[PDB]
């Protein structure tokens, strides 16, 4: 959340800067600043990929578990 | 001919200043244009990667 608010409030500071001084060394800076914040935006969901690979696991084993009773019991019945 | 060259020869300096004008002025829409292509440098070519 913090990544995105600062995403948005750059993008108003290169405004500010296309406002004022268009020639300023600042907006390569700027325009390499975002582009590091952008970085981290994938960075850090990348790293929700393995847990939610380790996640899908369990669930799987989960309703692998569940289908597994629920045969055993339809079985039964019959 | 050569006597209208020697009257503009007054007129010389403000179109020299207007020359700077124009200079500095293209060189700030170059500026704006250079800006948007660096942020869809960004958007299209880093992050999709």
């Known amino acids: 959340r913090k990544l995105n608010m600062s995403i ?27 582009k590091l914040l952008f ?8 790293e929700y990929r393995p847990h939610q690979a ?18 055993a019991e339809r079985f039964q019945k019959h | 001919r050569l006597l209208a060259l020697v009257k503009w020869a007054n007129n010389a300096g403000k179109v020299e200043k207007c020359a700077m004008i124009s200079s500095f ?7 704006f244009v250079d ?8 958007a299209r070519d880093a992050l999709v990667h």
């Open chain 1, 39 to 46: 970085v981290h935006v994938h960075h850090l969901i990348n």
């Open chain 1, 54 to 71: 380790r996640e899908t696991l369990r669930v799987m084993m989960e309703v692998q578990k569940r289908q597994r009773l629920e045969t």
């Open chain 2, 25 to 31: 002025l293209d060189q700030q829409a170059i500026l």
């Open chain 1, 8 to 34: 948005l409030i750059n993008f108003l500071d290169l405004l500010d800067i296309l406002i004022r001084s268009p020639g300023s060394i600042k907006r390569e800076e700027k325009l390499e600043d975002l």
């Open chain 2, 35 to 42: 800006t948007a292509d660096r942020l869809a440098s960004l």
